[PDB]
Amino acid sequence: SMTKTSVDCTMYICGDSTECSNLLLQYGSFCTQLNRALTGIAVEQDKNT
């Protein structure tokens, strides 16, 4: 296995700003799609072990 990692795509990109987070929403589902991918990796580390 490897280390399970997840990222808050909003806290990484816009960390604690509302007025950045409203611009990040204009990029659609990209943050959710990254979170999904990292969750799929993280579940696979238990499947493997």
- Site residues for another protein per CB under 8 A: 1-17, 19-20, 23-24, 27, 30, 34-35, 37-39, 41-42, 44-46, 48-49
Q: 32 is written with which tokens? A: 């959710």
- Shortest distance, position 29 Cβ to another protein, whole Å: 11
CA distance 38 to 8: 10
- Rounded least distance, CB 21 to another protein, Å: 10
What are the structure tokens assigned to 42, written together? 């993280």
- Enter the tokens of residue 7: 């990222």
Joined tokens for residue 39:
């969750």
Q: Shortest gap between Cβ of 6 and another protein (angstroms)?
A: 5
